[model samples]
Target: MEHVAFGSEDIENTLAKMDDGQLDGLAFGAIQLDGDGNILQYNAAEGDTTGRDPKQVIGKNFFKDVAPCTDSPEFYGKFKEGVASGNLNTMFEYTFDYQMTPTKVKVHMKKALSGDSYWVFVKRV
Candidate 1:
């Protein structure tokens, strides 16, 4: 498979076909979460970016525990709406200022094709 950039078009489809190797090789962060917002796959790039152990976050609720900052109308709201609609392909720029230093990032959320899971892609800007 070709290298997938952070801003690749139709990346949701591309990512669904990717294996762990491809996802981990991405330069930006890649996180997979169950429909209920539980963390499933947190890639190495995400761990390196957040300085948080991926293992510790796996199986946890992403909207609440892992990143409570996102539990709002802007972020989590979109996710829930998408899950309900079964079609989620959203992109936005956000500033995270809750736990860590205020960090600006570009985020993309998409529903996975394989299962009842979602994918969040983040790139620090």
Candidate 2:
């Protein structure tokens, strides 16, 4: 089995080659979104972390519908720029403060090398 470190420099490339099975096996949350911010693949860990049902989230707009709290520039704007520029690889610490307890997390946004899909990896801090 191929191992993928959360903070690996080549994480985007590594993720692009992984299927849903591999992503679900990871400890942290992994969410795959299309260019339009629609959820394409929601891993089990992400669902568990957020207490959301992955089945219900597929095809929904993540930034708008799923997590509107991230509609700001720091989160959504960065995603918008990355998508438009076609080189979206950013990592930062963020706090989720919506309906639930405010949780601090490390967020990694990366554009897949093979397609227009973008990935959001989150680890609780």
Candidate 3:
């Protein structure tokens, strides 16, 4: 994986130019989600990781294009329950077929601000 630098900048600018590695210094898939779970930002590393492109994913819903596994009733239920109960962090690991390769990923979800939005970081393992 190539290395990229994440410089200190204002929040909006940082969000705009922050690549996958810039977010956490790791080559992985990442998505910036709005309060409603709509994808607000996507990076090239993320596209490469998922074998997709930003054009195909940026405006789509995260749960729709990136990880449909989150759409299941049980999963969604837990998500909503956590949000309602003010749970701030959740982590889990899973494997999925990516371009016929069994790819392992660690998913992290964190709430940023009240009714503002959340960021979902996916690290390939």
Best by lDDT: 2
Residue range 69-117, candidate 1, lDDT tens digits: 8999999999999999999889999877766777889999988887888
By TM-score, highest first, what's the ranking?
Answer: 2, 1, 3
lDDT of 2: 0.86
Q: Predict model 1's lDDT versus the native.
A: 0.85
TM-score of each: 0.90, 0.91, 0.63
Q: What TM-score does model 1 achieve against the real structure?
A: 0.90
Give the Å shift of residue 19 in candidate 3: 8.5
Each prediction's whole-model lDDT (CA) = 0.85, 0.86, 0.58
Q: List the residue pairs that clash in candidate 3.
A: none
Candidate 2, run of 10 with poorest lDDT: 1-10
State which candidate, 2 or 3, has the greater TM-score: 2
| Candidate closest to the true structure, highest TM-score | 2
Which of candidates 1 and 3 is the stronger one according to lDDT? 1
